[PDB]
Amino acid sequence: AETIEIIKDLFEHLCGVRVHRTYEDDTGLWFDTSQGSKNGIMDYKLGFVKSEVDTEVIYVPLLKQRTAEELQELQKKLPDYLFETLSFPLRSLNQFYIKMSKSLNK
């Protein structure tokens, strides 16, 4: 249906990506994701938001789900900005997925 739906459906089948919970509200289409292999796992939520209409991706790191030791390992491997909530244009979603995937494999 919506471009957003199409993008989500493909995102859920990316290598190394496991989508758990999905919802749609007024702001857009949101889903919880686990990414990464044995080396490291990161949980995060993506939002595909539409609000003359604007589209953006919201990235929310889910750190509460980690143990302290897992968080310490992740903080060595990933850039500081992946421990904060981010917005970025859809055209950067590929760059985001590649950065996350490479950072977890390091």
């Binding site: 919201i58 981010l86 917005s87």
Partner: peptide, 28 residues
């Protein structure tokens, strides 16, 4: 797709409001 909970609806708005914009991810 699925109907949102109160927490999910709150979370969406809080996360949109507090998000830091980044244009791209790359190293030179």
């Amino acid at each position: 797709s699925n109907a949102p909970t109160l927490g999910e609806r709150l979370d969406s708005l809080h996360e949109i409001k507090s998000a830091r914009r980044m244009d791209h991810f790359n190293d030179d």
